[PDB]
C-alpha cells in the first residue's frame, strides 16, 4: 500500500506526460498526401517440397537464398532465382519454432519446444554440413533465435527471458528480465544497438544489448503481441496483436502514432513486415489472406490471396525486390 | 553457357534432395503420432507398459508404428504452445480419478480443450486412472462425492451398465457418474467432427496399447466415411 500508491502516482505521471506534447495526430498531419493506389500483387514463383506445415522463414544477405523449416523437423535452403534445394538439414528434434540466417551466410540456427536452438554450419571444411553448437540454459521454448554476427545470436524464450549468447563458449553473456508473460517475437535495429521484444502481456519492451536493461515500454493493445517489426529509419516499429489490430509506436514520441484496424476483420495478426520504402506495411492474418496497409494513411491497398491455410511467417528481402510467405499447407510463395 | 555447368551441379543437388525427401515423406506419412496430456503426477508416465517435445515413445503394434508425445518441460501457461498441435491423429487424456478436488480443474481444462478454436477437429481418447484407489476410497466412505458435487444426489446408474466381479453398486455409480459428466461435456457441443472414447484402467495393466489401436482405427474409419459424406 505504501508502494502501490507510489507506483500508481508514477504511472499517472507517465500517462500525463505521454498525453502532453501530443499536438495533433499522424492521421491529421499526413492526410494531405495522395493515396498509394491499388496494388496488383501476384505470384511470380511458388516453392514446394516440404513435408508438413511451415512455421518460420528468413531471407539471406544476398537476397537470393532463404531458409525455412516446418513442423516436419527439417531445414530447407531454397533459391528463389532458380528454385533449387541448396540444402536439406533435418533437426534432431522433429519440433521447431524459428529459423535464422546469419548475415555472413555461413551459419544458421533454429529451435523448437526442446528449449535449445542449436547452431548449424554451412561452410563445412570436410564437405559435410554438421551442427556446431547447441545452446542450453533456457527453460521454456524459443520463439526467436535471431543472429547478430558470426559469433553472437539474440534469443527470446517462452519463459519470459531473453538473452544474448556468445557462440564460441556457448554460454549466456547477458540476461534480459522484466517481461511479465511469454515473449514471442523480437527484431533488431539497423544499427544493431537496440532491439524490441513483444510479450504475451499486451506490452513490448525496448532494450540495449550493450548495457542490458529496459529503456522504455509500450502498451496499446488489448491482447498478446504475436509479431513485431522494426521501421527501417529506426524511429518506430509495428506489432501484430492477436486482438485483430496493428499499432505503430515512435521511440522519440514514446506513444502510439496511429493504428490499423477495421470491423471487416475479426482475426488476430500472425506476422508483420515493412516495405523497403516504408510506405507499404505487410500484415498477415488468420483467414489465409495477407493485407497491405498504407503505413501513412491507415488505408488498405488491396489484400493478396491464393494461399491454402493459416499463414505462419512473412518477410521481405534486404533490397525489397520480393516478398515471401509461409503457411501451414507446406507451401512457400514469392510475390513480385 | 559455361556458367550453366554450375546449373548442372545445382540440378544434381536438387535430384539428390528430392530422392531423400521421397523416403522422408513415405516414413513420415507412415508414422502415427499421439499427443499425451494430463495433470502432472496422474499416472501419466506409467499409463502404458512401454515394453517396445521432451518425452517421446516409439512402439510398434501388429506392424503399425506410433509416436507418443509428452511435452512436460514448460510452465503452467498453455495458451500459446498448444496451438502448435493442430494436426495430431488423436489426443490421450489421463486424469487421476481419485482426486475429487482436482477433478473440477481437470474438467475445466477438458472443456477448454474441446472448445479451443484450433483443436475443434481432434477427437480425444480418454483414460481414467486408479479405479482401484477410487473403489477403496468410496468403500471406506469417510469422504463422499456429495461433499463436492450436488448432482450425485439424484443420479441413477444408466441401463447401459456393465460391471465386473466385486464392483459394487456404489463403485459402479461413482465410475459412471464421472464418465457421464465427461460425456455431457463432450456432447454439449460436438458438431459431429470429434468425440471422446471413455476408458477405465489401473497402473498394472497392459491392454492399453490395444485400446489405443482400436480407438485410432475407429476414428480413422469415421474420418474416411465422412470424406465419403456418408
Amino acid at each position, epitope marked *: 500500500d505504501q508502494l502501490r500508491q507510489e507506483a500508481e502516482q508514477l504511472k499517472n505521471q507517465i500517462r500525463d506526460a505521454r498525453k502532453a506534447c501530443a499536438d495533433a495526430t499522424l492521421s491529421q498531419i499526413t492526410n494531405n498526401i495522395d493515396p498509394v493506389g491499388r496494388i496488383q500483387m501476384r505470384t511470380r514463383r511458388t516453392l514446394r517440397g516440404h513435408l508438413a506445415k511451415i512455421y518460420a522463414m528468413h531471407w539471406g544477405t544476398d537476397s537470393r537464398l532463404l531458409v525455412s523449416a516446418s513442423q516436419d523437423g527439417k531445414l530447407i535452403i531454397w533459391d528463389s532465382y532458380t528454385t533449387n534445394k541448396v540444402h536439406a538439414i533435418p533437426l534432431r528434434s522433429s519440433w521447431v519454432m524459428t529459423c535464422a540466417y546469419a548475415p555472413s551466410g555461413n551459419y544458421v540456427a533454429c529451435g523448437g519446444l526442446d528449449n535449445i536452438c542449436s547452431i548449424y554450419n554451412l561452410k563445412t571444411r570436410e564437405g559435410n554440413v554438421r551442427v556446431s553448437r547447441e545452446l542450453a540454459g533456457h527453460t521454456g521454448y524459443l520463439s526467436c533465435c535471431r543472429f547478430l554476427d558470426d559469433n553472437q545470436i539474440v534469443t527470446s524464450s517462452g519463459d519470459t527471458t531473453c538473452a544474448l549468447w556468445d557462440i564460441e563458449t556457448g554460454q549466456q553473456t547477458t540476461t534480459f528480465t522484466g517481461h511479465t508473460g511469454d515473449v514471442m517475437s523480437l527484431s533488431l535495429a539497423p544499427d544493431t544497438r537496440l532491439f524490441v521484444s513483444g510479450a504475451c502481456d499486451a506490452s513490448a519492451k525496448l532494450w540495449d544489448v550493450r548495457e542490458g536493461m529496459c529503456r522504455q515500454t509500450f502498451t496499446g493493445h*488489448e491482447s498478446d503481441i504475436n509479431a513485431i517489426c522494426f521501421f527501417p529509419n529506426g524511429n518506430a516499429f509495428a506489432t501484430g496483436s492477436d486482438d485483430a489490430t496493428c499499432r505503430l509506436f515512435d521511440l522519440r514520441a514514446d506513444q502510439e502514432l496511429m493504428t490499423y484496424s477495421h470491423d471487416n476483420i475479426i482475426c488476430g495478426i500472425t506476422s508483420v513486415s515493412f516495405s523497403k520504402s516504408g510506405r507499404l506495411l505487410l500484415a498477415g492474418y488468420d483467414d489465409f489472406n495477407c493485407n497491405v496497409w498504407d503505413a501513412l494513411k491507415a488505408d488498405r491497398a488491396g489484400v493478396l490471396a491464393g494461399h491454402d491455410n493459416r499463414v505462419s511467417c512473412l518477410g521481405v528481402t534486404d533490397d525489397g525486390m520480393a516478398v515471401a510467405t509461409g503457411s501451414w499447407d507446406s507451401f512457400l510463395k514469392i510475390w513480385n | 553457357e559455361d556458367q550453366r555447368n554450375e546449373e548442372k551441379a545445382q540440378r544434381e543437388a536438387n535430384k539428390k534432395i528430392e530422392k531423400q525427401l521421397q523416403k522422408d515423406k513415405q516414413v513420415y506419412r507412415a508414422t502415427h503420432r499421439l499427443l499425451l496430456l494430463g495433470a502432472d503426477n496422474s499416472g501419466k508416465s506409467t499409463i502404458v507398459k512401454q515394453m517396445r517435445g521432451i518425452f517421446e515413445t516409439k512402439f510398434q503394434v501388429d506392424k503399425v508404428n506410433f509416436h507418443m508425445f509428452d511435452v512436460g518441460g514448460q510452465r*503452467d501457461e498453455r495458451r500459446k504452445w498448444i496451438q502448435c498441435f493442430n494436426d495430431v491423429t488423436a489426443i490421450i487424456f489421463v486424469v487421476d480419478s481419485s482426486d475429487y478436488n482436482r477433478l473440477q480443474e481437470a474438467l475445466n481444462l477438458f472443456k477448454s480443450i474441446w472448445n479451443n478454436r484450433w483443436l475443434r477437429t481432434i477427437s480425444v481418447i480418454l483414460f481414467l486412472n486408479k479405479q482401484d484407489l477410487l473403489a477403496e476410497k468410496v468403500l471406506a466412505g469417510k469422504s463422499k462425492i456429495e461433499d463436492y458435487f450436488p448432482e450425485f444426489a439424484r443420479y441413477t446408474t444408466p441401463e447401459d451398465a456393465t460391471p465386473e466381479p466385486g464392483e459394487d453398486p456404489r463403485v459402479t455409480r461413482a465410475k459412471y457418474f464421472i464418465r457421464d459428466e465427461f460425456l455431457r461435456i463432450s456432447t454439449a457441443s460436438g458438431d459431429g467432427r470429434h468425440y471422446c472414447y471413455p476408458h477405465f484402467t489401473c497402473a498394472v495393466d497392459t491392454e492399453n496399447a490395444r485400446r489405443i489401436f482400436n480407438d485410432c482405427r475407429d476414428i480413422i474409419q469415421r474420418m474416411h466415411l465422412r470424406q465419403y459424406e456418408l
Partner: nanobody, 128 residues
C-alpha cells in the same frame, strides 16, 4: 492500459450477504468472457464462475452453486458477483480475469501466479 480493480470484500459473519465488483479499464469489455477465481491459504487457484459475452450463458462450480449470482453489466464495464449465505470454509482472496482471446469460448486464465490479465485482489473472511 489493461487495469482491473476489485471493490467490495471484507469481514462478515457466516451467512451474511456481501457484494463484489471488478470494473475493468482500457480494453473492449463486451468482446471477452469474464471469470472469477480464488485461492484459500495453503492451496492453489481454482475456477469459480464465468459468463459468456452477452450474459445469456453462465456456469458455476460445484460447491457454491445456487449461492452466488454472477451478473455482467456490459454498458458500465463492471462485473458483479453477489455473495449470499456464506460458509466458514469459503474464505480466500478473490480476483477477476478476462481470459485472453476475445470472440471465443476457450480460456487458460488460471496460470500458477503467472497470468497477466488478472485483477489485483480483494479480501473476504468469515468469523463469529
Amino acid at each position: 492500459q489493461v487495469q482491473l480493480q476489485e471493490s467490495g470484500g471484507g469481514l462478515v459473519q457466516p451467512g451474511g450477504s456481501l457484494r463484489l465488483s471488478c470494473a475493468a479499464s482500457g480494453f473492449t469489455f463486451s468482446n471477452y468472457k469474464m471469470n472469477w477465481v480464488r485461492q484459500a491459504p495453503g492451496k492453489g487457484l481454482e475456477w469459480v464462475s464465468d459468463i459468456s459475452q452477452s450474459g445469456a450463458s453462465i456456469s458455476y462450480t460445484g460447491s457454491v452453486k445456487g449461492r452466488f449470482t454472477i451478473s455482467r453489466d456490459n454498458a458500465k464495464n463492471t462485473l458483479y458477483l453477489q455473495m449470499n449465505s456464506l460458509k466458514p470454509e469459503d474464505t480466500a482472496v478473490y480476483y477477476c480475469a478476462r481470459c485472453p482471446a476475445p470472440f471465443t469460448r476457450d480460456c487458460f486464465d488460471v496460470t500458477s501466479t503467472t497470468y497477466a490479465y488478472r485483477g489485483q485482489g480483494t479480501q473476504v473472511t468469515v468469523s463469529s
